[PDB]
Design a protein around this ligand. Structure first.
Ligand SMILES: Cc1cc2nc3c(=O)[nH]c(=O)nc-3n(C[C@H](O)[C@H](O)[C@H](O)COP(=O)(O)O)c2cc1C
Length: 147
């Protein structure tokens, strides 16, 4: 199976998380393409992929709390080929904030409105993901199991 991982990361946490999930899928036999949201184009981005994993960090804001590189993709999610696509989301944040990993909720709800199939509840990491390595790996393992 071919998996697409797209992440938006400012300080590297969600990017480390994306790389960790990418290895777990690769060791399990998937063909994985991992991309920074700052370099992709929304149009047909999901075409040909069996599984798509989207991730991003949350930044307190009055209009949109998604990490900046991910906003253009998020605003054009309806052109990516999300209907009937198997997808799962993940993101890093901090539980000291009211909207803890609120970007994950935002992305899940819009993929659900576009007809995607959410295969697992989202991975929400509090603090340094290097300390949650077990949780990332375990989540990646359960996502493969739902495909
Ligand atoms: C100024 C600022 C605002 C933040 N706002 C939130 C927030 O609204 N919700 C949340 O869960 N985390 C928030 N965080 C925590 C960051 O999302 C967290 O540091 C995350 O690991 C950053 O991930 P990244 O390196 O992949 O961009 C905020 C951090 C900073 C510095």
């Amino acid at each position: 199976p071919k998996a697409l991982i797209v992440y938006g990361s400012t300080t590297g946490n969600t990017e480390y998380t994306a790389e960790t999930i990418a290895r777990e899928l690769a060791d399990a036999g998937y063909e994985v393409d991992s991309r920074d949201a700052a370099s992709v184009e929304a149009g047909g981005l999901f075409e040909g992929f069996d599984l798509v994993l989207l991730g991003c960090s949350t930044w307190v804001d009055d209009s949109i709390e998604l990490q900046d590189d991910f906003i253009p993709l998020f605003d054009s999610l309806e052109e990516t080929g999300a209907q009937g696509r198997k997808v799962a989301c993940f993101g890093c944040g901090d539980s000291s904030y009211e909207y803890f990993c609120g970007a994950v909720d935002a992305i899940e709800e819009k993929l659900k409105n576009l007809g995607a199939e959410i295969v697992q509840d989202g991975l929400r990491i509090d603090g340094d993901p290097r300390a949650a390595r077990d949780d990332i790996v375990g989540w990646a393992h359960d996502v493969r199991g739902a495909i």
